[PDB]
Structures are given as C-alpha cells and as structure tokens.
Write a protein that binds this ligand. Structure first.
Ligand SMILES: *[C@](O)(CCl)[C@@H](N)Cc1ccccc1
Length: 290
C-alpha cells in the first residue's frame, strides 16, 4: 500500500501518494499530463516498487484532489517550482529520478532545465519540447483519419461545436487510435479524464480536447533550451502516439546521450498498452544509473 497525504507545498495544498520499498534502490517522481488531469492514470507505474523503485505520485495544482491556486499561477514555470518544493519538502537533498507523461513530459523537461542537479535521471514519455510542433504533427494525424471523422473535426471544430455528437464521435475515434489503443480502458485512465473535465486547468491551459489547443500553452516551446540537459535521459513514445515520434526525435536530438525508444503497436498511454514492457524499460534505465 502507499502513504497518502494532503500537504501544503509552496502556498497551496497538494495531494500526493508515496509508494516505497522494499529494498529501495532509488526514488522516482512522476508528473501526470493534461495539463489538468491527475496522477491516477500513472498508477500502473506502481509495479516498479517490486524492483526497488519508490514511486511518488501527486496531483499538480488545480488537478485531481489538489487545490486550485490563483489563475495567474496556471503556468509551466509555476508547475516546475511546485515540483521542486514537493521533492525537497519530502526527500530533502536526495537525488531523484523524474518521469513525465505527455504534458508532464514537457513539465519534466522544464524542470530538468532548471533543477537537473537534483536529478539522477530523466524519463519523458509521449512528451514534447514544442507545443506548436506537436500541433503540426497532430494536424497531420487528423488528415490521416478517414474522411468521415476528419471532416467532422474540421467542420464542427471550426465552428466551436464541440458538443456535436458527430464531432464527439470523431474525437473518440482519434483517442482509440492515438491516445489509448484499447476497447476496455482502465478505471485509472477514465478517472484522470474525468478530473480533467471537472477542474479548470485543462480548459484554461490546454483547450477542448487532446488535439484542439487553444489554451495558454499553445505557443510554449523550449526546444532551444533542452540541449542543456546533461543527465541520463530516456525518451519513450508510441508508434501511433498522438504526440508522434517525430516530436520525440526533436527532444532526443538536443539531449546528448539520451535514449529514444518507440513502442510498436502502442500510442500515447504506453504505460497501459504495454505495462510490463513499459515498466521493464524504465526499471532497467533507473537501475542502470544509480
Ligand atoms: C498529455 O498531457 C496528455 Cl496525458 C497531452 N495532453 C499533452 C499535450 C498534447 C498535445 C498538445 C498539448 C499538450
């Protein structure tokens, strides 16, 4: 079982879940995506605890069970500071491994740029160093979908009719192809999705859905800053990932000595599409960089 708490970080109450031991060899901090989702969908990473890896989960500001700060604090930079405050006021000055999924991947990159000295390694899964680039790629994926859904996305999406059933049907299709390739989605994932729709972070920072970014991160791009990361880095991405391997390649290029692994037959939530394989990869990476 894990230890759950609702502690006050640098100003706001953040919910976190720490699953540690037995035979702890390293600590791994995780950053969920969205922005505006929850740690819930990363619970599958809990398996690594049996490999000597302590896993820390937490709901970022305004996410899941955590309280929402002032609107002005809805930025990646604030998220980074929040992450460091949590790491310190919990692990002291210990060097920890950092993993981020999608937006959490971007968030993990921003963190590394400033606090890599507190890290022993970095893991970016379905992450991105450029939203504009990510958008370009997803736009290609849209055009590749069957006209039936592609047209619906361009039609209703252009008129702001996200409530339309045809549009929603097209959105769902895209998800079952580039978000999670499964007909039986795990409760953990559905819960994070529910949290994204219930809170305000996703709507404000991101937009209506995964491929419609009108939020405050639409122009975020730190590709020219990530080459500064010199710590061991593991970059993963799915073959049919909504944040395509081309975006992952861009990250891979900048971080010298970084590793890039493309999961075949998988998309964005590779932690569930290939749980054993995904956990094994990260576990080996972590254990080989102690
Ligand atoms: C990940 O957070 C989802 Cl788990 C993803 N929404 C990040 C993202 C994708 C495309 C454009 C902006 C952000």
């Amino acid at each position: 079982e894990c230890i759950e708490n609702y502690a006050k970080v640098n100003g706001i109450y953040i919910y976190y879940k720490l699953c540690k031991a037995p035979e702890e060899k390293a600590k791994l901090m995780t950053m969920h995506g969205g922005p505006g989702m929850s740690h819930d969908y990363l619970l599958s990473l809990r398996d690594m605890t049996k490999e000597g890896i302590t896993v820390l989960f937490y709901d970022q500001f305004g996410c899941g069970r955590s309280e929402e700060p002032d609107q002005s604090k809805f930025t990646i930079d604030y998220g980074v500071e929040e992450a460091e405050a949590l790491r310190s006021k919990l692990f002291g000055n210990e060097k920890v491994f950092l993993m981020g999924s999608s937006y959490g991947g971007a968030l993990a990159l921003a963190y590394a740029v400033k606090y890599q000295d507190h890290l022993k390694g970095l893991i970016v899964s379905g992450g991105l160093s450029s939203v504009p680039l990510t958008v370009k790629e997803m736009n290609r994926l849209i055009d590749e979908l069957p006209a039936k859904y592609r047209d619906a996305i361009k039609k209703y999406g252009s008129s702001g009719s996200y409530e339309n059933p045809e549009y929603q049907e097209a959105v769902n299709y895209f998800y079952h192809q580039h978000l999670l390739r499964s007909e039986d989605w795990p409760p953990e994932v559905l819960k994070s999705l529910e949290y994204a729709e219930r809170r305000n972070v996703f709507r404000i920072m991101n937009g209506p859905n995964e491929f419609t970014i009108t939020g405050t991160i639409k122009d975020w791009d730190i590709t020219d800053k990530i080459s500064a990361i010199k710590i061991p880095t593991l970059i993963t991405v799915g073959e049919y990932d909504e944040v395509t391997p081309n975006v992952a390649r861009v990250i891979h290029e900048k971080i010298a000595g970084s590793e890039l692994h493309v999961f075949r037959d998988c998309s964005h939530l590779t932690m569930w599409e290939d749980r054993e394989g995904y956990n094994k990869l990260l576990s080996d990476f972590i254990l080989k960089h102690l």
